[PDB]
Amino acid sequence: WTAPKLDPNTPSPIFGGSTGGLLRKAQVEEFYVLTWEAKKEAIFEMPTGGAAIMRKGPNLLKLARKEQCLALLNTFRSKMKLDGCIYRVFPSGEVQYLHPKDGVYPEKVNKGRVGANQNMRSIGKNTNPAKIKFQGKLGPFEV
């Protein structure tokens, strides 16, 4: 995984339209793009609602939330055993490689990942909130 995969203009799945697609948030704030390689043409379920047909080869799909993209990708991986990546696209026009964020699915341990938000202690060894009183602390968990 030398570099993240770039985002081309690949064909989108066949869909008749729905009212569950992108709202104004895509225009003002952000929206997410899911791209996957399909082994064969098949009918999948849109996370917004309705049924769509994915095209053989690469597909591109823009969705409102990362959760929708990841739910659909997890469906593709667990049922159809496909591979896919997610991008975040801002209104300024800069995309952002999101899934898996390493080139390796997070459930598989991969070298080079650095532990973030790890407390090297058990849950009961957290101090009491009275000891961190009047301190800029989120809670006992962040000390």
Partner 1 sequence: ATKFPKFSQGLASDPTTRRIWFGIATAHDFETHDGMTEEKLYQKIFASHFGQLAIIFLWTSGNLFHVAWQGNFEKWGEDPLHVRPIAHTIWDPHFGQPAVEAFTRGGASAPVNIAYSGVYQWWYTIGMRTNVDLYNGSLFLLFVAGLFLFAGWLHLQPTFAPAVSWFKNAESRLNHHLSGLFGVSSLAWTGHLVHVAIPASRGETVRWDNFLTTLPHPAGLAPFFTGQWAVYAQNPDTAGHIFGTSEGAGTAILTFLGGFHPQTQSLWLTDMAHHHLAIAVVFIIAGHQYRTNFGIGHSMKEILEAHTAPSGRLGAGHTGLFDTVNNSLHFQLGLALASVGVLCSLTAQHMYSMPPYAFLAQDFTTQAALYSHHQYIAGFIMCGAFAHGAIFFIRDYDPEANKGNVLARMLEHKEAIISHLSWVSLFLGFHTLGLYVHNDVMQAFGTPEKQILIEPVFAQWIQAAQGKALYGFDILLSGDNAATAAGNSIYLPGWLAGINSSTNSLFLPIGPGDFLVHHAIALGLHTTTLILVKGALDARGSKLMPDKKDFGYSFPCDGPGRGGTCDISAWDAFYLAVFWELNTVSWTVFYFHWKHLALWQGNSAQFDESSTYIMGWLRDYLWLNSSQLINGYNPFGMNSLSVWAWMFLFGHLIYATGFMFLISWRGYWQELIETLVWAHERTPLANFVKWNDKPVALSIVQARLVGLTHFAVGFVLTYAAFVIASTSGKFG
Partner 2 sequence: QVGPPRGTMVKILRPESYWFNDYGKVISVDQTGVRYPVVVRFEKVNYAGVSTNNYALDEVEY
Partner 3 sequence: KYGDESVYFDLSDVEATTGSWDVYGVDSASRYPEQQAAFFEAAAQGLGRREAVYSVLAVSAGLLTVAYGVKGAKDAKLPITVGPQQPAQVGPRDRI
Residues 123-142 that bind partner 2 (CB under 8 A): 123-124
- Under the binding rule (CB under 8 A), the answer on residue 115 touching partner 2 is no
DSSP string, 44-86: EE-SSSSEEEEPSEEEEEEES-HHHHHHHHHHIIIII--EEEE
Residue 63: φ, ψ to 5° = -135, 160
- Under the binding rule (CB under 8 A), the answer on residue 60 touching partner 3 is yes
Shortest Cβ distance from residue 125 to partner 2 (Å)?
9
- Under the binding rule (CB under 8 A), the answer on residue 43 touching partner 1 is no
Are 35 and 58 within 8 A, CB to CB? yes
Token couple for 57: 């080869």
Residue ranges that bind partner 1, judged by CB under 8 A:
19, 23-24, 123-124, 126, 128-131, 133-134, 136, 139-141
Residue ranges that bind partner 3, judged by CB under 8 A:
7, 9-12, 14, 21-22, 24, 26-27, 31, 33, 55, 60, 62, 89, 91-93, 95
